[PDB]
A = this chain, B = another copy of it.
Amino acid sequence: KVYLRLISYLKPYWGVALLVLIGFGMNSATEVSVAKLIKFIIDAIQNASRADLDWFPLLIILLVFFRGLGLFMGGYYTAVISRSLVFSIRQEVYAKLLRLPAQYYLDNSSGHITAKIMYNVEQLTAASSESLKTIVRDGMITLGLLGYLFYTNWRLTICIMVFLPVIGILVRKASKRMRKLSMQVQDTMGDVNHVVQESINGNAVVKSFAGEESEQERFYKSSEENLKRGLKMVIVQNLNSPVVQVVMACAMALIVWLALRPQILGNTTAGEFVAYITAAGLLSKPVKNLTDVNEKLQRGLAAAHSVFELLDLPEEQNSGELKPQLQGAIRFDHVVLNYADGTQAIKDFSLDIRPGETVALVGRSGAGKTSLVNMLVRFQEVSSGQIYLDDLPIRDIELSSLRTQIAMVNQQVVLFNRTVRENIAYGQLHNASDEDVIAAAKAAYAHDFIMNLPNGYDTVLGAQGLNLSGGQRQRIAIARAILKNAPILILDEATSALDNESEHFIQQAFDEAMQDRTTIVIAHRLSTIENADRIVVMDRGQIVEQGTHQELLAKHGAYYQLHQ
């Protein structure tokens, strides 16, 4: 249950959880004394007393002081507990979100995912910090003053326990509706976030094709739906608070009718009954506030359900092992890549890559080039197969120990909005050295244009590194990959947008490194493949042919086709 799990998050706050009770507890004892205060002043003034009459002024300053000190400490602690608990929620949510599999990222766009911690969790803050204080107040205060009301006269008060089911039904019935609608408005917000996020991502596409008008219609429709849902939610919530007062007002009228009969009014002591009316009003107000905060309470519950679903989602796994890979020799054996959608791209595959080799994959597009690499780094779980990395199961090695020792250059190079040095030295090697980055840049051929930048290595990039160049942005990935001195360098189309001269120097640097690795090259070119130790012709996953550059040319086959 949502409520049960929330309590588990405030376990270390029990010591502070009772201080807030005391602070409002004194406040609960402050608003009950007013009923006694009115009776006391009426008795003193009615009897023309002077000793207890001139003493009244000191009783409101002292009384109000309790409405202050005690209200602040109790009122301020509510924010502390709720804000601290949410801080441990969003912070802990980030860990699982980062540890989630790449498949989850594919299914949900940035707008949907970001709204789940930026808005979903955000509403939980205002729905908990403000709601917890309001509910505990409109609780303990009402409880205390109603207990006092029972003590002064139990006979009349017991009549109040007749309409209680009516208020319960009017609130329970009026709460399930908002709970159902609360999840709907949150879902609509995700669509709103998705449209803006996609528009930001595709600004280049949006402006080029004059799609701004089309984007507005979808965003306008989503905003209209959200507004209608909010207005509908307001109708039910705002309709409940006045109604619950009407039934309580009828109860007050009935109890007054019962009490004010002449046979019961023989000796009333009006000062006593006016205290009763004041207590009744001081119950009516807090219950009205409790009914008003119903929307705030319900909003948090809907957010909590989605948050905990995200927490329970099936994140990645681990095995436990630590090895240096001794120049890991990757040996695929009957590996398949049956995707969730249904497409099959690694139907059949097998290799015996040896340490120090330069195996490269060449073939037609849409065959599984950048799909087999993912399972090597564990970005995609294997199906009906396994990989023997260093003559041992790949799964047995930890993800941290595996990804940290495998340099990668993705087809779509991603650059963070930070300084150039941080991007080149991003990751576990953020504290490598102040000169290692220079060596990596020189090897990658990026040590010529960085100095030409306005600031140099400490220049902040753009939104996604668009401001460097069409080709320079790619060199940053190569630079960081070479900086990461792992004995693996999967150059997955690393030299795609680079110029003829720039790529030639990078190939020369790779050849001259004199630190032979098991680098895998996936390039749609012959210059990089001409020097490959072994060339594997792959089409639709199946290995069409294998051999060296000379062997394939003599055999012709499919390689001869890709030689025009």
Contact (Cβ within 8 A) B64 A249? yes
Q: Shortest CB–CB separation between residue A418 and chain B, in angstroms?
A: 8
Contacts of A377 in B (CB 8 A): 207-208
Bound complex: CA A194 to CA B461 (Å): 14
Copies of this chain, count: 2
Assess whether A108 is interfacial by the CB under 8 Å rule. Answer: yes
| Residues on the B chain within 8 Å of A63, using CB | 249
B-contacting 9-mer, from A10-18, A320-328, A423-431:
A423-431
A226 closest partner in B (C-beta): B87
Please tell me which one of the listed residues B260, B274, B463, B472 contacts residue A42 in the complex, with CB atoms under 8 A apart. B274
Nearest B residue (CB) for A281: B34
A6: CB under 8 A from chain B?
A: no
List residues 377-405 of chain A with CB under 8 A from any CB of chain B.
377, 379, 400, 403-404
Q: A211 contacts which chain B residues (CB < 8 A)?
A: 426-428
Q: How far is the CA of A424 from the CA of B205 in the complex (A)?
A: 12
Cα A438 to Cα B83 with chains together (Å):
55
Interface pair B204/A410, CB less than 8 Å apart: yes
Cβ of A126 within 8 Å of any chain B Cβ, yes or no, is: yes
Asked if residues B239 and A72 are in contact (CB atoms below 8 Å), the reply is yes
Chain B CB within 8 A of A550 CB: no
Residue contact A98 to B256, C-beta cutoff 8 Å: no
CB contact between A65 and one of B56, B246, B454 (< 8 Å): that residue: B246
CB distance from A451 to the nearest CB of B (A): 12
What CA separation (Å) do A466 and B194 show in the bound complex? 17
Cβ contact within 8 Å between A427 and B470:
no
Q: CB of A484 within 8 A of chain B?
A: yes
Asked if A45 lies at the interface with its beta carbon under 8 angstroms from chain B, I say yes
| Complex Cα gap A157–B215 (Å) | 60
Contact yes or no, A84 B499, CB < 8 A: no
Query: Interface stretch among A111-119, A139-147, A176-184?
Result: A111-119
| A469 touches B (CB below 8 Å) | yes
Does A166 lie at the interface of the complex (its beta carbon under 8 Å from any beta carbon of B)? no
Q: How far is the CA of A108 from the CA of B234 in the complex (A)?
A: 36
| A201–B414 CB distance below 8 A | yes
By beta carbon, the residue of chain B nearest A213 is: B428
Give Cα A68 to B241, complex, Å: 8
Instruction: Give A281 to B105 CA distance when docked, in angstroms.
Output: 57
- Judge if A553 is at the interface, Cβ distance under 8 Å: no
Cα distance A126–B107 in the bound complex, in angstroms: 31
* Contact in complex: A227, B41 (CB < 8 Å): no
Residue of B nearest to A46 (CB): B270
Nearest B residue to A410 via CB reads: B204
Cβ-defined contact, B270 with A379, below 8 A? no
Assembly CA distance A470 to B109 (angstroms): 18
- The verdict on A350 contacting chain B, using a C-beta distance below 8 Å, is no
Q: Is A502 an interface residue (CB 8 A)?
A: yes
CB-CB under 8 A from A68, the residues of chain B are: 242-243, 245-246
Chain B neighbourhood of A463, CB < 8 A = 105-106, 108-110
Chain B proximity mask over A457-468: 1 for CB below 8 Å, otherwise 0? 000001110110
Chain B residues contacting A416 (CB-CB under 8 Å) are 198, 201-202, 205
Minimum CB distance partner of A233 in chain B: B79
B501 and A524 contact, CB distance less than 8 A: no
A517 at the interface (CB under 8 A from B): no
Report whether B209 and A98 are in contact in the complex, using a CB–CB cutoff of 8 Å: no
Q: Are A498 and B95 in contact (CB under 8 A)?
A: no
- A337 → chain B, closest Cβ, in Å? 13
**Other A-B pairs beyond A87-B224, A97-B199, A499-B524, 16, CB < 8 Å:** A41-B277, A57-B256, A61-B253, A79-B230, A87-B223, A87-B227, A91-B216, A95-B216, A98-B212, A99-B212, A109-B417, A110-B110, A205-B414, A209-B426, A209-B427, A366-B472
Q: List 9 A-B contacts (CB under 8 A).
A: A57-B254, A67-B245, A68-B246, A71-B242, A91-B219, A91-B220, A205-B414, A366-B449, A498-B524
Closest 10 CB pairs of A and B: A209-B427, A68-B242, A64-B249, A365-B471, A365-B499, A210-B404, A57-B253, A106-B462, A211-B427, A79-B234
